[PDB]
């Protein structure tokens, strides 16, 4: 398993801003219901999931981004 920003059919991450950035429910629902991950939340403007299947495409990210998204 892995963590990351899952990509949709068009290769785009799921955007999240405003309340959907402060409250994790929107991204947690996308992560679990659409991507079958364990959980998720909004990290720096896009839905970040925990426990995605290894084969699920995730968006490119710097090592500092993964560390930041993982530590919260």
Residue numbers in the entry: 1 to 72
Provide excerpts from the study:
β-Scorpion toxins are polypeptides of 60–76 residues stabilized by four disulfide bridges. β-Toxins induce a hyperpolarizing shift of the voltage-dependence of activation via a voltage-sensor trapping mechanism, whereby toxin-mediated interactions stabilize a persistently-activated conformation of the channel domain II voltage sensor. The extensively-characterized Bj-xtrIT from Hottentotta judaica is a member of the ‘excitatory’ (inducing a spastic paralysis) anti-insect β-toxins and its structure was the first of this class to be solved by X-ray crystallography. This extensive reticulation establishes the tertiary structure that presents the bioactive surface as well as conferring significant thermostability and resistance to proteolysis.
In this study we show that the Bj-xtrIT β-scorpion toxin can be expressed in its natively-folded conformation by secretion of the polypeptide into the oxidizing environment of the E. coli periplasm. Instead, periplasmic co-secretion of the four bacterial chaperone proteins DsbC, DsbA, SurA and FkpA encoded by the pTUM4 plasmid enabled robust toxin over-expression. Purified Bj-xtrIT-(His6) toxin at a concentration of 10 mg/ml was mixed 1:1 (v/v) with 0.2 M NaCl, 0.1 M Bis-Tris; pH 5.5, 29% PEG 3350. Recombinant Bj-xtrIT-(His6) has both the βαββα-fold and C1–C4, C2–C6, C3–C7, and C5–C8 disulfide connectivity of the native fold. An all-atom structural superimposition of Bj-xtrIT-(His6) with the untagged Bj-xtrIT structure shows that there is a root-mean-square deviation (RMSD) of 0.45 Å. The structures differ only in side-chain rotamers for some residues located on the surface of the toxin, reflecting the difference in crystal contacts that the toxin forms under different crystal packing conditions (space groups C2221 vs I4122). Localized denaturation of the α-helical regions could account for the temperature-dependent changes observed by SRCD signal, but overall the protein displayed significant thermostability that is consistent with a correctly-reticulated toxin structure.
